Every structure is written in C-alpha cells, then in structure tokens.
C-alpha cells in the first residue's frame, strides 16, 4: 500500500471511532461505525491472499448486520421518543436491538463466531487494530446507554462470552485465535460490570488494550503466528521469552501483575451489589484463559523446544523492527498493581 494512502485510511479509522465518541446524534453514531468499517476493510486486505478476503468478507457481513440492527434500534428510538439524543433508549425493544448490535460489533458470544476466523485471516497489525481499537467505539455507546440496557441480557452475554472465550482457546495452537478467544473472555469481563460500575469497565478496557498491544507487539517483533514458531524465540532472542512470560502471566490475572487489577476490582464492584455467585463463577472460568496462557508459557519461556540449524544465521542479525512502545507497554502491563487506585482518573 502507498504510505500516504495508509496514513489517510488509518486516520479515517480513528476519525470513525472519534465521531462515535464525541457525537450527540444517533445518526452520527451510525455514521462513525460505517466510516470505521469502510476504512478498516483495506487494513485487513493488506497482503492480498484468499484468507484476508475471506476474513474481510466475514467481518463485513457481521459488522453490516450489526450496523443495520443499530439503525433499527435508532429508528425505534425515534418512534418512541421523537428525538435523536445519544442517551438512554425509550423502548426495551430498541435497547435489546442496540445491545445485540453492539455485542456483534464487539464480537461477544454468541456473536463471537467471527472473531477467531477474522483475526486468523488478517495480519498481526490489523489484528491488533481489530482487537484493541475496534472495541472503543461500541463500548462508548454501551457506556452511554446503560440506563436502558437490560440486566439479564448483558449478563447473559457476559457469562456466555467468558465461558466460550475460556473453552475456545484451550484447543488452539495459532496465536491469533488464542488472542481472539482471550478477547471474547475479556469482553465478557468488561460487560459484566457495566451496569454496576462503568469506571471498572473503562479500567478493564484500558488494561486489556495495554496487555493485548504488548502481546501483538511481541508477536510482530518476533514474527510469530503459531505456538511452535514462538517456541524458537529462546534461541533467537531470550529477552522476548521473559517478556511473553510476564505478559501472559499478567493476562491470566495472576497477582501481583496488572491484569489481576481489573477482574479483582470487578469482583470488588459486583459484591457491593450483592452478587456473589456470578463473580465467583466468572473468576473460576477465568482459570481456563489462564490455562492456555500457561500452555504458551510452557512452550516459550519455561522450557526450551528444539530449534533448527538455520537459526544460527539469524543470530548474526539484530531485530530492525520498530518495536513501538514495547518496553513501555511491557512495564505498564506487569508492574502496575501498586498503582491500582489510579483508576479514579477514569471516573
């Protein structure tokens, strides 16, 4: 791709998310989602193979279905309220349709069925954009309509996302599908606390984006898409094994790491509202995510899988890849728990 065209298209992706974030009219919300999808399709088709065309087709169909259900929810809001302010919806049918549309745009279960395919079909950088930047706009719309979101619907979506994103990654060897099922489970964690305290939703979103961006940046810096090629990293760059070790232990929510920070706070906001069974079963189901993280740490850092002979040539070259913010994101995804009361800046 032409770099000027790449910059204009990425600024258009950002502009779509911004127009979702800053606008007060539902038509501009729908316009921002349309602009975001329309600009992110070439980022997914960056390399021009049949897998990226399949992934972009599946992404287009699911996001287009979600955009049409979003506009039907908007139009029903116009029926029952005569106005267009981006606030609570004035009909439970419009609330259900908009919650379904945003659960499709986030790829929460049982609308998760596009996330592990599309992430596998696209490169690692566009997978990073899909799993970090494409969450910000629908979570903003969910942030603004939470007076009207049905409790049972969003909690069913949350627990179904956590359980399906737990069991999905247990069978995987591809790193992009592992990050995608990790995405599904984390979106379940983010929407389980949305109606109780949306500040912890914003906390979980920020800590998730930091940890996901760390893992995709490590996968790009080592050019690794499978488990078995990530297992050659100790013979190529032994620092990256320590980095994926601490970041995968952090994404599992093991204390004293930063990814223990959201889910603990989530439990801390779900027991104040007298829900005990629900954060308990959520935290027990998070052990599945921890299990396939531990599988990756056994394959990469804590053991040494056998390498090949041609690795000796790759010893004679240093990584010239721009590892943008990788030490910063590594620190901010592991050593951040003593700064846990910083979350009040998100209030």
């Amino acid at each position: 791709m032409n770099p000027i065209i790449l910059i204009i298209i990425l600024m258009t992706v950002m502009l779509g998310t911004i127009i979702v974030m800053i606008s007060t009219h539902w038509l501009l919300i729908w316009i921002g989602f349309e602009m975001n999808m329309l600009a992110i399709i070439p980022i997914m088709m960056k390399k021009h193979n049949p897998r990226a065309t399949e992934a972009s087709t599946k992404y287009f169909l699911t996001q287009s279905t979600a955009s049409m259900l979003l506009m039907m929810a908007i139009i029903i809001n116009l029926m029952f309220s005569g106005q267009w302010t981006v606030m609570k919806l004035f009909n439970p049918m419009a609330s259900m349709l908009m919650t379904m549309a945003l659960a499709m745009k986030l790829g929460m279960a049982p609308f998760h069925f596009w996330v592990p395919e599309v992430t596998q079909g696209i490169p690692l950088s566009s997978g990073l954009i899909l799993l970090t930047w494409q969450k910000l706009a629908p979570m903003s719309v969910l942030y603004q309509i939470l007076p009207s979101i049905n409790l049972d619907l969003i909690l069913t979506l949350s627990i179904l996302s956590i359980t399906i994103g737990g069991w999905g990654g247990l069978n995987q060897t591809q790193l992009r599908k592992i990050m995608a099922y990790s995405s599904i489970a984390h979106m379940g964690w983010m929407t389980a606390v949305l109606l109780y305290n949306p500040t912890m939703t914003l906390l979980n979103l920020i800590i998730y984006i930091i940890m996901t961006s760390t893992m995709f940046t490590l996968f790009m810096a080592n050019s690794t898409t499978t488990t078995l090629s990530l297992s050659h990293t100790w013979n190529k760059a032994p620092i990256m094994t320590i980095l994926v070790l601490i970041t995968l232990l952090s994404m599992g929510g093991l204390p004293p790491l930063s990814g223990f920070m959201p889910k603990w706070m989530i439990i801390q906001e779900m027991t104040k509202n007298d829900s005990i069974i629900l954060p308990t079963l959520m935290a027990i189901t998070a052990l599945l995510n921890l299990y396939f993280y531990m599988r990756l740490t056994y394959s990469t850092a804590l053991t040494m899988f056998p390498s090949t002979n041609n690795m000796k040539m790759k010893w004679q070259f240093p990584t010239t890849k721009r590892m943008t913010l990788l030490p910063t994101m590594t620190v901010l995804s592991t050593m951040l728990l003593p700064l846990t009361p910083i979350l009040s800046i998100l209030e």
Binding site: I41, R51, T53, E54, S64, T65, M72, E117, V118, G121
Partner: protein, 98 residues
C-alpha cells in the same frame, strides 16, 4: 401504533431472517442486506414525514448514501471472492476453520 409501520418492520424482519439464513450465494446475502437498508429508509422516511420534523428529512438520504457506499464495498468483496473461486458461494469461504 400505525398499521403501515407493522408492515415495514415485518419487512425488515423478513429481510433479516433472509440475511440470517444463507442458501449459497453471497449476492443473495447482499440483496437481503440492502432490503434491510431499504426498509430502514422507508420507516425513517414515514416517521420524519409524519412528525413534520423538518431537519431530519436529510437523514434518510444520508442513510441511503453511506449504506450504498457500504453496498459498493460489499460488492467489491464479492468480486474478490469471485476472482478466487469463480463463484460467490459461501461454502468456499471456509479456510478459517483451521
């Protein structure tokens, strides 16, 4: 509420269930998606004309334009799939199962 709104909503749900139950062609899925868009255009138009809400009369045109641009993008995706397998069959889009 009004009796024509029943039919426009039911048309949206018919085109929804057509878009949610594929047969073979990706073009039939795109046509169901644009039937959904057409029903949204009609329903928004009948409300905005019915309420005499003047400034929202530019709203359906916008709802047309963006979505037709969306349709153009979808057609291009179909063509790229049609430039890979010769047809637009959705069962050829199954490489991402593994």
């Amino acid at each position: 509420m009004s009796l024509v709104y029943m039919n426009i909503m039911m048309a949206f749900t018919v085109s929804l269930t057509g878009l949610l139950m594929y047969r073979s062609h990706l073009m039939s899925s795109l046509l169901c998606l644009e039937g959904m868009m057409l029903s949204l255009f009609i329903l928004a138009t009948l409300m905005i004309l019915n309420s005499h809400f003047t400034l929202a009369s530019m709203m359906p045109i916008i709802l047309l334009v963006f979505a037709a641009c969306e349709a153009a993008l979808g057609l291009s995706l179909l063509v790229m799939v049609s430039n890979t397998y010769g047809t637009d069959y959705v069962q050829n889009l199954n490489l991402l199962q593994c």
